[PDB]
Write a protein that binds this ligand. Structure first.
Ligand SMILES: O=C(O)CNC(=O)C(=O)O
Ligand SMILES: [Mg+2]
Ligand code: NI
Ligand SMILES: [Zn+2]
Length: 331
């Protein structure tokens, strides 16, 4: 078995290997990359996502989200308070302000210490989940707006044609902006490209151990667990690396820098934080190996998780017994 300790693997594809996206994912899996739940891909030196980032300031962030924490430094939830619209240039100025900017630090490990010590005492503002793309249309390799769709994959594997669409999303971050512990909708893959700015630190639990994280979470968030049998689908709970280690939960960590891709694998729980002003693009995707995970994915039906239009067909075809209850949660 390849990668039996479930370490995060880093890949350096050549320009020739960067042509065929599906083939390269399958290659990474042949080497055991999926066992970690997360892999890093450093693009060939010849590649670029677009020519420059000099002209992005007028993108609108219609609903910036202030991430307000509750709990203790290593075990907390966050809620999202909606703020007034602002442009990317306005948001960048805000991220760089004395109130929000990255503190002085020695290295990524010092900054990570400072994040976990101090996160809960601040409420950073995240421009998340903005439909759109920063890849140039002429970028032919690893262009996250030009990937094979999940609907087409399901149709190819299973023969059933379904409604729905699959487009990327932009994320504008600042110091301390946080992504809570989660797997993707329907335990899909994700791919995330850090277009510009400061790094993103990731934490990940191997897919084979995801239920250990779920059992800890039920213990640490006992009210939430009574409310919903899949409350991590709400994407609000944070648990620090120190608390994971104290409870024997297997995990790994890695920092993504500008110009790098990350892939999350089916049922790989992940969480993390941004170091300072940045912009990332991400999208879900599927492969043949996903189908069995999609069939077994948990679902929130309490009403909290509310998701896209396109998840309806995935539930309906892959999980017909659960469909009626899940759809009630949607309505
Ligand atoms: O970058 C973020 O805020 C969160 N991203 C992801 O969870 C992802 O790409 O799967
Ligand atoms: Mg612009
Ligand atoms: Ni994710
Ligand atoms: Zn729920």
């Amino acid at each position: 078995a390849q990668n039996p300790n479930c370490n995060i693997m880093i890949f350096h594809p050549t320009k020739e290997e960067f042509n065929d996206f599906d083939k390269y994912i399958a290659y990474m899996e042949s080497q055991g990359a999926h066992r970690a739940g997360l892999a890093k891909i450093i693009p060939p030196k010849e590649w670029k996502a677009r020519e420059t980032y000099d002209n992005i300031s007028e993108i609108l962030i219609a609903t910036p989200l202030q991430q307000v924490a509750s709990g203790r430094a290593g075990v907390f939830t966050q809620y999202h308070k909606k703020k007034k619209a602002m442009t990317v240039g306005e948001y960048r100025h805000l991220a760089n302000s004395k109130k929000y900017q990255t503190p002085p630090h020695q290295n990524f490990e010092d900054l990570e210490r400072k994040y976990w010590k101090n996160r809960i005492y601040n409420s950073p503002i995240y421009g998340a989940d903005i439909s759109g793309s920063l890849f140039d249309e002429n970028t032919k390799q690893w262009n996250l707006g030009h990937l094979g769709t999940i609907q087409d994959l399901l149709e190819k594997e299973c023969g059933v044609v379904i409604e729905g669409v699959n487009t990327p999303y932009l994320y504008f971050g600042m110091w301390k902006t946080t992504f809570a512990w989660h797997t993707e909708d329907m335990d899909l893959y994700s791919i995330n490209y850090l277009h510009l700015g400061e790094p993103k630190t990731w934490y990940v639990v191997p897919p084979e151990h995801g239920q250990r994280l779920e059992r800890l979470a039920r213990e640490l968030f006992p009210g939430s667990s009574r409310g919903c049998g899949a409350f991590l689908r709400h994407k609000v709970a944070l648990i620090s690396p120190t608390v994971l280690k104290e409870n024997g939960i297997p995990f790994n960590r890695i920092t993504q820098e500008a110009g790098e891709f990350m892939v999350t694998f089916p049922y790989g729980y992940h969480a993390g934080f941004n170091h300072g002003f940045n912009c990332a693009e991400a999208i879900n995707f599927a492969t043949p190996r996903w189908i069995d995970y999609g069939k077994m994915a948990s679902q929130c039906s309490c009403g909290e998780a509310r998701v896209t239009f396109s998840m309806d067909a995935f539930v309906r075809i892959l999980q017909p017994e659960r469909y009626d209850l899940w759809k009630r949660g949607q309505d």
